[PDB]
Design a protein around this ligand. Structure first.
Ligand code: NA
Length: 330
Protein backbone atom coordinates (compact mmCIF):
# COMPACT_ATOMS: atom_id res chain seq x y z
CA UNK A 1 0.00 0.00 0.00
CA UNK A 2 3.00 2.31 0.23
CA UNK A 3 2.62 3.25 -3.43
CA UNK A 4 -1.15 2.68 -3.31
CA UNK A 5 -3.41 5.66 -4.02
CA UNK A 6 -5.57 6.79 -1.07
CA UNK A 7 -9.30 6.77 -1.91
CA UNK A 8 -10.09 9.97 -0.01
CA UNK A 9 -7.18 11.76 -1.71
CA UNK A 10 -8.08 10.50 -5.18
CA UNK A 11 -11.58 11.94 -4.75
CA UNK A 12 -10.54 14.96 -2.67
CA UNK A 13 -12.11 17.38 -5.16
CA UNK A 14 -15.21 15.27 -5.77
CA UNK A 15 -16.64 13.84 -2.54
CA UNK A 16 -15.82 12.32 0.82
CA UNK A 17 -15.20 8.57 0.87
CA UNK A 18 -16.66 6.66 3.81
CA UNK A 19 -17.09 3.26 5.41
CA UNK A 20 -19.72 1.71 7.68
CA UNK A 21 -18.07 0.26 10.80
CA UNK A 22 -18.55 -1.11 14.31
CA UNK A 23 -16.04 -1.26 17.21
CA UNK A 24 -14.95 -4.74 16.09
CA UNK A 25 -14.32 -3.92 12.42
CA UNK A 26 -12.64 -0.66 13.39
CA UNK A 27 -9.96 -2.80 15.05
CA UNK A 28 -9.93 -5.48 12.34
CA UNK A 29 -9.72 -3.01 9.44
CA UNK A 30 -8.10 -0.08 11.24
CA UNK A 31 -5.24 0.54 8.80
CA UNK A 32 -7.47 0.42 5.71
CA UNK A 33 -9.80 3.00 7.26
CA UNK A 34 -6.92 5.23 8.34
CA UNK A 35 -5.35 5.09 4.87
CA UNK A 36 -8.48 5.55 2.75
CA UNK A 37 -11.57 7.13 4.30
CA UNK A 38 -12.53 10.57 5.59
CA UNK A 39 -16.06 9.66 6.68
CA UNK A 40 -17.49 7.03 9.02
CA UNK A 41 -21.00 5.62 9.59
CA UNK A 42 -22.10 3.27 12.37
CA UNK A 43 -23.30 0.06 10.73
CA UNK A 44 -25.68 -0.73 13.61
CA UNK A 45 -24.72 1.05 16.81
CA UNK A 46 -26.56 4.31 16.20
CA UNK A 47 -29.86 2.62 15.38
CA UNK A 48 -32.71 2.94 17.89
CA UNK A 49 -32.39 -0.50 19.50
CA UNK A 50 -28.68 0.09 20.13
CA UNK A 51 -29.08 3.58 21.61
CA UNK A 52 -32.24 3.33 23.73
CA UNK A 53 -32.94 -0.42 24.27
CA UNK A 54 -35.37 0.39 27.09
CA UNK A 55 -37.20 3.66 27.73
CA UNK A 56 -34.90 6.01 29.61
CA UNK A 57 -31.94 3.66 29.23
CA UNK A 58 -29.42 5.06 26.75
CA UNK A 59 -26.42 2.99 25.68
CA UNK A 60 -24.01 5.30 23.85
CA UNK A 61 -20.86 3.28 24.59
CA UNK A 62 -20.39 1.64 21.19
CA UNK A 63 -21.49 4.76 19.29
CA UNK A 64 -19.09 6.86 21.38
CA UNK A 65 -16.22 4.52 20.47
CA UNK A 66 -16.98 4.89 16.77
CA UNK A 67 -17.20 8.67 17.02
CA UNK A 68 -13.96 8.89 19.03
CA UNK A 69 -12.19 6.84 16.37
CA UNK A 70 -13.47 9.11 13.59
CA UNK A 71 -12.61 12.33 15.42
CA UNK A 72 -9.11 11.19 16.38
CA UNK A 73 -8.42 10.69 12.66
CA UNK A 74 -10.23 13.82 11.46
CA UNK A 75 -12.94 11.79 9.71
CA UNK A 76 -16.49 13.11 9.34
CA UNK A 77 -19.38 11.06 10.74
CA UNK A 78 -22.83 10.35 9.28
CA UNK A 79 -25.54 9.51 11.80
CA UNK A 80 -27.57 6.41 10.91
CA UNK A 81 -30.46 6.29 11.70
CA UNK A 82 -33.27 7.86 13.78
CA UNK A 83 -36.68 6.67 12.53
CA UNK A 84 -36.92 3.28 10.81
CA UNK A 85 -39.41 0.39 10.70
CA UNK A 86 -36.54 -1.96 11.57
CA UNK A 87 -34.29 -2.34 14.61
CA UNK A 88 -36.60 -0.36 16.90
CA UNK A 89 -37.61 -1.89 20.29
CA UNK A 90 -41.22 -2.89 20.90
CA UNK A 91 -41.42 -0.69 24.02
CA UNK A 92 -41.47 2.38 21.78
CA UNK A 93 -44.96 1.67 20.46
CA UNK A 94 -46.54 0.07 23.54
CA UNK A 95 -48.01 1.34 26.80
CA UNK A 96 -48.10 -0.33 30.20
CA UNK A 97 -50.85 -2.75 29.19
CA UNK A 98 -48.94 -3.73 26.05
CA UNK A 99 -51.43 -1.84 23.89
CA UNK A 100 -50.27 0.60 21.21
CA UNK A 101 -49.68 4.14 22.46
CA UNK A 102 -51.39 7.22 21.05
CA UNK A 103 -50.14 9.64 18.40
CA UNK A 104 -49.15 12.29 20.95
CA UNK A 105 -47.32 9.82 23.19
CA UNK A 106 -45.35 8.30 20.32
CA UNK A 107 -44.43 11.80 19.12
CA UNK A 108 -43.16 12.63 22.61
CA UNK A 109 -41.03 9.48 22.59
CA UNK A 110 -39.76 10.26 19.09
CA UNK A 111 -38.83 13.82 20.06
CA UNK A 112 -37.10 12.68 23.23
CA UNK A 113 -35.02 10.05 21.43
CA UNK A 114 -34.09 12.38 18.58
CA UNK A 115 -33.28 15.27 20.92
CA UNK A 116 -31.11 13.19 23.26
CA UNK A 117 -29.19 11.39 20.52
CA UNK A 118 -28.68 14.35 18.18
CA UNK A 119 -27.68 16.73 20.97
CA UNK A 120 -25.07 14.30 22.30
CA UNK A 121 -23.20 14.26 19.00
CA UNK A 122 -23.86 17.84 17.93
CA UNK A 123 -20.65 19.30 16.53
CA UNK A 124 -19.18 15.86 15.80
CA UNK A 125 -21.78 14.41 13.43
CA UNK A 126 -22.51 16.62 10.41
CA UNK A 127 -25.53 14.82 8.97
CA UNK A 128 -28.27 12.41 10.01
CA UNK A 129 -30.41 9.89 8.17
CA UNK A 130 -33.60 11.04 9.92
CA UNK A 131 -36.10 8.84 8.09
CA UNK A 132 -34.97 5.52 6.64
CA UNK A 133 -36.87 3.43 4.07
CA UNK A 134 -40.35 4.91 4.60
CA UNK A 135 -41.27 4.44 0.93
CA UNK A 136 -42.86 1.13 -0.09
CA UNK A 137 -40.55 -1.24 -1.94
CA UNK A 138 -43.49 -3.06 -3.53
CA UNK A 139 -47.12 -2.44 -4.43
CA UNK A 140 -48.79 0.73 -5.66
CA UNK A 141 -48.89 2.53 -2.31
CA UNK A 142 -46.51 5.42 -1.63
CA UNK A 143 -45.57 4.44 1.91
CA UNK A 144 -44.45 1.22 3.54
CA UNK A 145 -46.44 0.00 6.55
CA UNK A 146 -44.85 0.68 9.95
CA UNK A 147 -45.92 1.28 13.54
CA UNK A 148 -44.58 4.84 13.32
CA UNK A 149 -46.97 5.59 10.47
CA UNK A 150 -49.83 3.52 11.90
CA UNK A 151 -49.84 5.29 15.27
CA UNK A 152 -48.83 8.84 14.32
CA UNK A 153 -50.19 9.15 10.80
CA UNK A 154 -48.50 9.97 7.49
CA UNK A 155 -47.07 13.22 8.88
CA UNK A 156 -44.71 11.27 11.15
CA UNK A 157 -41.85 12.09 8.78
CA UNK A 158 -42.57 15.83 8.87
CA UNK A 159 -42.35 15.69 12.66
CA UNK A 160 -39.14 13.63 12.73
CA UNK A 161 -37.33 16.15 10.51
CA UNK A 162 -38.59 19.11 12.55
CA UNK A 163 -37.45 17.50 15.81
CA UNK A 164 -34.01 16.76 14.37
CA UNK A 165 -33.64 20.27 12.95
CA UNK A 166 -34.51 21.71 16.36
CA UNK A 167 -31.94 19.41 18.00
CA UNK A 168 -29.13 20.53 15.63
CA UNK A 169 -30.02 23.17 13.00
CA UNK A 170 -26.51 22.94 11.51
CA UNK A 171 -26.84 19.27 10.59
CA UNK A 172 -27.80 18.11 7.10
CA UNK A 173 -30.94 15.99 7.45
CA UNK A 174 -31.50 13.09 5.05
CA UNK A 175 -34.24 10.81 3.80
CA UNK A 176 -32.35 7.53 3.12
CA UNK A 177 -33.53 4.51 1.08
CA UNK A 178 -32.51 1.55 -1.13
CA UNK A 179 -33.58 0.45 -4.65
CA UNK A 180 -33.52 4.22 -5.16
CA UNK A 181 -32.78 3.98 -8.88
CA UNK A 182 -35.62 1.71 -10.00
CA UNK A 183 -38.03 4.14 -11.82
CA UNK A 184 -41.21 3.29 -9.91
CA UNK A 185 -39.60 3.72 -6.49
CA UNK A 186 -37.50 6.68 -7.66
CA UNK A 187 -40.69 8.56 -8.49
CA UNK A 188 -42.18 7.73 -5.08
CA UNK A 189 -39.08 8.97 -3.26
CA UNK A 190 -39.01 12.06 -5.49
CA UNK A 191 -42.70 12.75 -4.85
CA UNK A 192 -42.27 12.26 -1.11
CA UNK A 193 -39.26 14.54 -0.71
CA UNK A 194 -40.77 17.14 -3.03
CA UNK A 195 -43.96 17.17 -0.96
CA UNK A 196 -41.97 17.66 2.25
CA UNK A 197 -39.76 20.36 0.72
CA UNK A 198 -42.91 22.05 -0.61
CA UNK A 199 -44.17 22.21 2.98
CA UNK A 200 -40.98 23.86 4.17
CA UNK A 201 -39.88 20.74 6.05
CA UNK A 202 -36.14 20.79 6.87
CA UNK A 203 -34.93 17.99 4.60
CA UNK A 204 -31.56 18.84 3.07
CA UNK A 205 -30.58 15.66 1.30
CA UNK A 206 -31.45 12.29 -0.14
CA UNK A 207 -29.34 9.29 0.76
CA UNK A 208 -29.00 6.68 -1.97
CA UNK A 209 -28.06 3.42 -0.25
CA UNK A 210 -26.79 1.90 -3.48
CA UNK A 211 -26.98 -1.75 -2.45
CA UNK A 212 -26.39 -2.72 -6.05
CA UNK A 213 -25.57 -5.78 -8.14
CA UNK A 214 -23.41 -6.31 -11.20
CA UNK A 215 -26.39 -5.65 -13.48
CA UNK A 216 -28.88 -3.56 -11.49
CA UNK A 217 -29.57 -0.75 -11.58
CA UNK A 218 -28.38 0.24 -15.05
CA UNK A 219 -26.04 3.20 -15.50
CA UNK A 220 -28.87 5.06 -17.27
CA UNK A 221 -31.15 4.45 -14.27
CA UNK A 222 -28.46 5.68 -11.89
CA UNK A 223 -27.93 8.80 -14.01
CA UNK A 224 -31.68 9.41 -14.18
CA UNK A 225 -32.09 9.03 -10.41
CA UNK A 226 -29.19 11.38 -9.67
CA UNK A 227 -30.65 14.02 -11.98
CA UNK A 228 -34.19 13.51 -10.72
CA UNK A 229 -33.23 13.90 -7.06
CA UNK A 230 -30.72 16.68 -7.77
CA UNK A 231 -33.53 18.66 -9.42
CA UNK A 232 -35.13 19.07 -5.98
CA UNK A 233 -32.17 21.17 -4.85
CA UNK A 234 -31.11 18.66 -2.19
CA UNK A 235 -27.58 17.42 -1.54
CA UNK A 236 -26.93 13.79 -2.46
CA UNK A 237 -24.96 11.20 -0.52
CA UNK A 238 -24.36 7.62 -1.65
CA UNK A 239 -24.68 5.98 1.76
CA UNK A 240 -24.19 2.20 1.76
CA UNK A 241 -22.55 1.29 -1.52
CA UNK A 242 -21.69 -2.30 -2.36
CA UNK A 243 -21.76 -4.34 -5.55
CA UNK A 244 -23.06 -7.83 -4.89
CA UNK A 245 -21.72 -10.71 -6.96
CA UNK A 246 -25.26 -12.16 -6.87
CA UNK A 247 -28.40 -10.83 -8.56
CA UNK A 248 -31.61 -10.82 -6.48
CA UNK A 249 -32.79 -14.09 -8.07
CA UNK A 250 -29.41 -15.76 -7.55
CA UNK A 251 -29.59 -17.57 -4.20
CA UNK A 252 -26.67 -19.98 -4.74
CA UNK A 253 -24.74 -20.94 -1.60
CA UNK A 254 -21.99 -23.15 -3.03
CA UNK A 255 -19.56 -20.57 -4.42
CA UNK A 256 -16.41 -20.74 -2.32
CA UNK A 257 -14.96 -17.88 -4.33
CA UNK A 258 -16.04 -15.50 -7.12
CA UNK A 259 -15.24 -16.43 -10.72
CA UNK A 260 -12.77 -14.48 -12.83
CA UNK A 261 -15.79 -13.28 -14.80
CA UNK A 262 -17.47 -11.97 -11.63
CA UNK A 263 -14.30 -10.19 -10.52
CA UNK A 264 -13.80 -8.70 -13.97
CA UNK A 265 -17.39 -7.51 -14.34
CA UNK A 266 -17.31 -6.10 -10.81
CA UNK A 267 -14.20 -4.10 -11.70
CA UNK A 268 -15.88 -2.67 -14.81
CA UNK A 269 -19.05 -2.00 -12.82
CA UNK A 270 -17.21 -0.02 -10.12
CA UNK A 271 -15.28 1.93 -12.73
CA UNK A 272 -18.49 2.88 -14.53
CA UNK A 273 -20.18 3.75 -11.23
CA UNK A 274 -17.41 6.07 -10.10
CA UNK A 275 -17.04 7.65 -13.53
CA UNK A 276 -20.72 8.56 -13.23
CA UNK A 277 -20.35 9.83 -9.65
CA UNK A 278 -17.40 12.00 -10.66
CA UNK A 279 -19.48 13.40 -13.52
CA UNK A 280 -22.03 14.52 -10.92
CA UNK A 281 -19.49 15.77 -8.38
CA UNK A 282 -21.43 19.04 -8.16
CA UNK A 283 -24.40 17.33 -6.49
CA UNK A 284 -22.82 14.26 -4.87
CA UNK A 285 -20.90 15.25 -1.74
CA UNK A 286 -20.15 11.87 -0.17
CA UNK A 287 -19.87 8.21 -1.11
CA UNK A 288 -19.88 5.68 1.73
CA UNK A 289 -19.39 1.94 1.23
CA UNK A 290 -21.29 -0.37 3.56
CA UNK A 291 -17.99 -1.73 4.85
CA UNK A 292 -14.51 -1.54 3.36
CA UNK A 293 -13.04 -5.01 2.73
CA UNK A 294 -14.57 -8.38 1.84
CA UNK A 295 -13.63 -9.89 5.22
CA UNK A 296 -16.73 -8.15 6.60
CA UNK A 297 -20.00 -7.58 4.76
CA UNK A 298 -23.66 -7.87 5.70
CA UNK A 299 -24.13 -9.50 2.29
CA UNK A 300 -22.56 -12.70 3.63
CA UNK A 301 -25.89 -13.38 5.35
CA UNK A 302 -28.34 -11.29 3.34
CA UNK A 303 -30.48 -12.09 1.53
CA UNK A 304 -29.06 -15.60 1.89
CA UNK A 305 -27.85 -16.60 5.34
CA UNK A 306 -24.58 -18.49 5.61
CA UNK A 307 -22.93 -17.76 2.27
CA UNK A 308 -20.08 -15.50 1.20
CA UNK A 309 -20.07 -12.40 -0.99
CA UNK A 310 -17.21 -10.18 -2.25
CA UNK A 311 -18.83 -6.73 -2.74
CA UNK A 312 -16.13 -4.17 -1.90
CA UNK A 313 -12.88 -2.68 -3.25
CA UNK A 314 -10.50 -4.65 -1.00
CA UNK A 315 -10.32 -8.42 -0.54
CA UNK A 316 -10.28 -10.48 2.65
CA UNK A 317 -6.54 -9.89 3.02
CA UNK A 318 -7.11 -6.12 2.67
CA UNK A 319 -5.44 -6.09 -0.75
CA UNK A 320 -6.86 -3.93 -3.55
CA UNK A 321 -9.07 -5.83 -5.99
CA UNK A 322 -9.34 -5.12 -9.74
CA UNK A 323 -12.38 -2.97 -8.88
CA UNK A 324 -10.08 -0.73 -6.81
CA UNK A 325 -7.87 0.14 -9.75
CA UNK A 326 -10.74 0.96 -12.08
CA UNK A 327 -12.47 2.99 -9.36
CA UNK A 328 -9.49 5.29 -8.66
CA UNK A 329 -8.49 5.84 -12.28
CA UNK A 330 -11.73 7.50 -13.42
NA1 NA B 1 -19.06 16.87 -4.74
Amino acid sequence: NSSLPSLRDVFANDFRIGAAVNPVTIEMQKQLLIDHVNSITAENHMKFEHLQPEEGKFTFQEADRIVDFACSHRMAVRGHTLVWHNQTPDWVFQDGQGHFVSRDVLLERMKCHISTVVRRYKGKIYCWDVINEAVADEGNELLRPSKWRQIIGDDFMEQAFLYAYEADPDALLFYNDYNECFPEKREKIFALVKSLRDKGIPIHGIGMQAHWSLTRPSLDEIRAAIERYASLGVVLHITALDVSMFEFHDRRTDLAAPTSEMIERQAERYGQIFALFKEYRDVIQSVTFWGIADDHTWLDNFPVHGRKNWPLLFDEQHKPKPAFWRAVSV
